[PDB]
Amino acid sequence: LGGDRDFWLQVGIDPIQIMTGTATFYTLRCYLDDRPIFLGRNGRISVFGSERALARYLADEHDHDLSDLSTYDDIRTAATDGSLAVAVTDDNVYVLSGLVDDFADGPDAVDREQLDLAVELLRDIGDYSEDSAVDKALETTRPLGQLVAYVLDPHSVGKPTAPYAAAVREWEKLERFVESRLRRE
Ligand SMILES: [Br-]
Ligand SMILES: [Br-]
Ligand SMILES: [Br-]
C-alpha cells in the first residue's frame, strides 16, 4: 500500500473528478454490494478543489460513510505517510458542464460518451442520497429521459422533435439537485 502501483484498485475505491460549469471537484467513490458509496455523510458528498486538499482531508481522523471500510485504513495510513497518490483514471472523469446548452440545441449537439458518464454519476448520486430525483427524471416517458435514451442509443429512430425547453428545464432541476448533494471543503 502507498506508492504501490494499482493502489486504488487494491483498496477498491475510485478517486473521481467532477467538472461543473464553475468548478472541478475531487472525491472518492466505491461500490458496496452494487450500491454506490461516496466520501461523505448523510447522503451528502464531500468535494475538494484539488487533489492535495483531498489527500490532506484523508489524513485527518473523520467519521464518514467510507471510514468503516476494510481498506480505508490503507487510505488514511498512506495519507499520513505522504505516499498517497490521488489519480483519476479517464473513465472516472465526469463532465456535467455544457450539457444544459447542448440539450437546448437538440440531441445531435449532445456528446454520447459525455452523457453516458454523466448519467452514471447522476444515478450514483441519487442512489447514495436515496433520492428518486434522477431516477424519475430519466424515465423514458418524460422529456429529459426520452431525449437521454435517444442520445445514448445510436440505433434509435424515434427522434425527439424541437424545441427542447422541457428537457432543458428537467436537466436544470437535476443540476440543482446535484449542487445540493455536494458539501464543499
Ligand atoms: Br425531448
Ligand atoms: Br417537464
Ligand atoms: Br452541479
Numbering used by the authors: 236 to 420
From the paper:
Here, we demonstrated that SatS, which we revealed is required for M. tuberculosis growth in macrophages, functions in the export of SapM and an additional subset of the proteins exported by the SecA2 pathway. We further identified properties of SatS that indicate a function as a protein export chaperone that protects its substrates from inappropriate interactions in the cytoplasm and additionally assists in their export. SatS is a highly acidic (pI 3.83), cytoplasmic protein with a role promoting export of a subset of the proteins exported by the SecA2 pathway. Finally, we determined the structure of the C-domain of SatS (SatSC), which reveals a new fold lacking similarities to any solved chaperone structures, yet contains surface hydrophobic grooves resembling those of the SecB chaperone.
To gain further insight into SatS function, we collected diffraction quality crystals and determined the crystal structure of SatS to 2.3 Å. Upon inspection, the electron density map only corresponded to the last 185 amino acids (L237-E420) C-domain of the SatS sequence (SatSC). The molecular weight of the SatSC crystal was ~25 kDa as determined by SDS-PAGE, indicating that the protein underwent in situ proteolysis in the crystallization buffer. Although we set out to solve the structure of SatS in its entirety, we were only able to obtain structural information for the C-terminal half of the protein (SatSC), which arose during crystallization. Further investigation revealed striking similarity between the experimentally derived SatSC secondary structure and the predicted secondary structure of the first ~180 amino acids of the N-domain of SatS (SatSN). The SatSC and SatSN domains are also similar in size with 41% sequence similarity at the amino acid level. This raised the possibility that SatS is comprised of two similar domains with an intervening ~60 amino acids that is predicted to be a flexible, disordered linker. However, the primary sequence and secondary structure similarity between the N-terminal and C-terminal halves of SatS raise the possibility of SatS being comprised of tandem SatSC-like domains. SatSC displays α/β secondary structure comprised of a mostly parallel, four stranded β-sheet core, flanked by seven α-helices. Investigation of the SatSC structure revealed a large network of negatively charged amino acids surrounding two surface exposed hydrophobic grooves, which are similar in arrangement, shape and size to the hydrophobic client binding sites of a SecB monomer.
